[PDB]
Symmetry: C3
Subunit: 332 residues, 3 copies
């Protein structure tokens, strides 16, 4: 009887940060309430000033990470304001039935809807927009995110012992297909609808023009680098709603990795690089052992360093010479 369950309202935060939550459930099953507003907006995606008409959940690419526990109910109020121009909906890979909620959430500009589903399977899962006839266009314009459904007793290692993270980040990786004129210059459009047939043609090449973390080349660098300290346990959730990726922490490892993101399976240990298939979210747990700058990349290094799929961690603490040292510094 759902009306007897506690309700809790969560305010979402912008990626790569994640809203507050408990790893081990401190209550019984709850109805967890979320609100997202759809925003179509112009986004500058690279250093050259290339602009696209992005389609977003809550103003960001990716959409925010939602966190619940196994056998909670998720109740999402989805708002499509009349300042938008397109029909949108939402499909949760975490959910069972009705195209993951897609069939029940079709909202025209000026409409809203509220969907409830039971989170029956633990793991990280993609969510994305999926309107009839225009699915890849919405998804590859940025309209995707992820949801984490934790086991009620938190994460476990391959021997079933508790794994507790100190920090959690969400990296959403996005393949964009910006249309090009004859010479290879990127085209510009006044509205999302103008771009449609050119977008379809660009998509059919299967060759992205940009592949980015958190919505732009360089978004997770500088003042926006991810941070940690030596000794901290970090969980990095990574999603790709459309195309395969192969994350790698340069200078580190994935100590425990759920590459296809489903926590009832034992983690893979000591990964250098792992494959997250398009349409999947994965999670990797690492304990930092050395300070300094780390690069977190898609390890197709062209996709990383030429197309944009690279971010940074900045890690503070003590250097350990037993793990690595320069014996003879570069010299003639």
């Amino acid at each position: 009887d759902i009306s007897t369950l506690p309700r809790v309202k969560v305010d979402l935060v912008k990626p790569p940060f994640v809203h507050a939550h408990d790893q081990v459930a401190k209550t019984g099953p709850r109805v967890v309430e979320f609100t997202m507003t759809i925003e179509e907006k112009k986004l500058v995606i690279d250093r050259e000033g290339t602009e696209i008409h992005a389609m977003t959940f809550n103003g960001s690419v990716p959409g925010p990470l939602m966190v619940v526990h196994e056998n909670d109910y998720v109740e999402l109020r989805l708002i499509n304001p009349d300042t938008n121009t397109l029909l949108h909906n939402i499909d949760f890979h975490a959910a069972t039935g009705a195209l993951g909620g897609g069939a029940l959430t079709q909202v025209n500009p000026g409409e809203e809807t509220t969907l409830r589903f039971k989170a029956t399977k633990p793991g990280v899962f993609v969510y994305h927009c999926a309107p009839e006839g225009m699915v890849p266009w919405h998804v590859t314009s940025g309209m995707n995110g992820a949801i984490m459904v934790l086991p009620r007793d938190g994460l476990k290692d391959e021997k079933g012992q508790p794994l507790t993270y100190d920090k959690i980040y969400y990296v959403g990786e996005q393949d964009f297909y910006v249309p090009k004129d004859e010479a290879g210059n990127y085209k510009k459009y006044e509205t999302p609808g103008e771009a449609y047939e050119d977008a379809v043609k660009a998509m059919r090449t299967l060759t992205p023009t940009h592949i980015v973390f958190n919505g732009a080349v360089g978004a997770l660098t500088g003042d926006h680098a991810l941070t940690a300290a030596v000794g901290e346990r970090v969980l990095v959730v990574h999603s790709q709603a459309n195309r395969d990726t192969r994350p790698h922490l340069i200078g580190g490892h994935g100590d425990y990795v759920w590459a296809t993101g489903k926590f009832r399976n034992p983690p893979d240990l000591d990964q250098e690089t792992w494959l997250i298939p398009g349409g999947t979210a994965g999670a990797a747990f690492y304990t930092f052992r050395q300070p300094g700058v780390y690069a977190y990349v898609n390890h197709n290094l062209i996709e990383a360093f030429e197309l944009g799929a690279a971010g940074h961690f900045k890690v503070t603490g003590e250097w350990n010479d037993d793990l690595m040292t320069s014996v003879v510094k570069p010299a003639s």
Copy 2:
């Protein structure tokens, strides 16, 4: 002594259906006899009427699924009628030696051959044509299928308890590379041999023009949608002989998945999407919990919705509001 073993003759059926078989072996080891006839035929692959010269086992793309048990012998009579124009053969990834049988099965038009091999490893496996010097051309013209070698005691879950399916379907996914003229229009040819050098050039782009299930855009829709009922346990075998794919059931999950298709390994649990590498068959087990239409796709959504890699399930039964419900239907 093989002559003392029972022989059983199996008549194959057209994909996505599968010939009758027992999950748990009701006899000792047998010699299982199959016959396939090679057919080169014109195939219309999309809604626009694009035609290719397909190269098929038994008239279909994919070729039919063959089902045996571990330590059966498979005896295949392979016929290449004199109405064909090309040399063909067959390579079974299930088999050991002689290029998977490829070295022993080279048949010119007007010839036949009979190969026997022992099915020593349990799993789903690709089979495909592989003639010297023209391997990818035959395979990417449709000349591939799969064989399932069941354990003698049937399938097991991650804890070694029996898993029994009520229905089984075979989805063969095919990447086609249709040659294009200068402006991007698909070319037509009178015979398979005319297309050869143009086919090689189209293949070398590594960019398929079409990616389809069961031989055509829309083949597993409408009257040809896959069917099931709420509560039924369905095994979906999926093969890709040349290129990676990432299957996803829209509105469902892979409850138990052997993504690389080999049943001595424990299944992965609760998959949203899984990667089947090119040259592999995989299998996913799901119990339907909600009625309605489901889409089964390659979750590179461009490959799905623009290039053709999407089919439907139509599921009958009772709707469960505890799993999902519309709380507030789309409204102003």
Copy 3:
């Protein structure tokens, strides 16, 4: 106290062969000393005489396989002679900190450096060059290899019983992006630096022109085919520093496979084909059961047979008719 540990100097050998080592460690932890010299050289990569300016560790593509045990220290002397023109460095995915050693190993022509790191995680791992601003160019010009860190008690199967190999080979798979003029002819350059902007443009297509094993189309064929005997246990280490691959032994299997190469995980059993993600090394163990020629390929068969990613094994011994036999040889 590292100064009290034994030191052992290893001389590396050319791929696909591997330097001598013990599977089960016969000593306590050691400092293992290696020397590599960087060589920029012209390489002919295909039958047509296409030449590139390759960037190599120790004169080969891939660089040599280094073999140590878990909790050894690796001390690498890296030499960049003044006959080279570029700055190089080395990143070990096996190592922890400083971009895998990349931040500490930047050597101009005429310089050398010595790096030490502790091999804390068992597995096969990529190493590659990674200079600031030119990472994918160096890697896709051939500047990558692998290192194997064995458990001190050798390899184990899925039940923890010893697995011992009789022979070990290293297959390095390389994606090249040779720039093309307007008509599609490959361009030639006097020096590595001349090619830079054309190389970047060719890389951004994400479409390799060649994909090769051991540095050239046909390199592992003929007199350079890999060899084994019926009954031998062979470990094949395979690396791809930039792009996914899907190895397959034509006529065989992967009996035990670590597709992402990390030995604390149980192996996958009975694989037909497995996916090694770009930026990863994997390892597959097979016992040969039949004599003859086998082809070892990337099972995107276009990449294999058109772009170059195919090699051969030649296996001697006795034919077993119980596993496979021609019942009726091809006839009218």
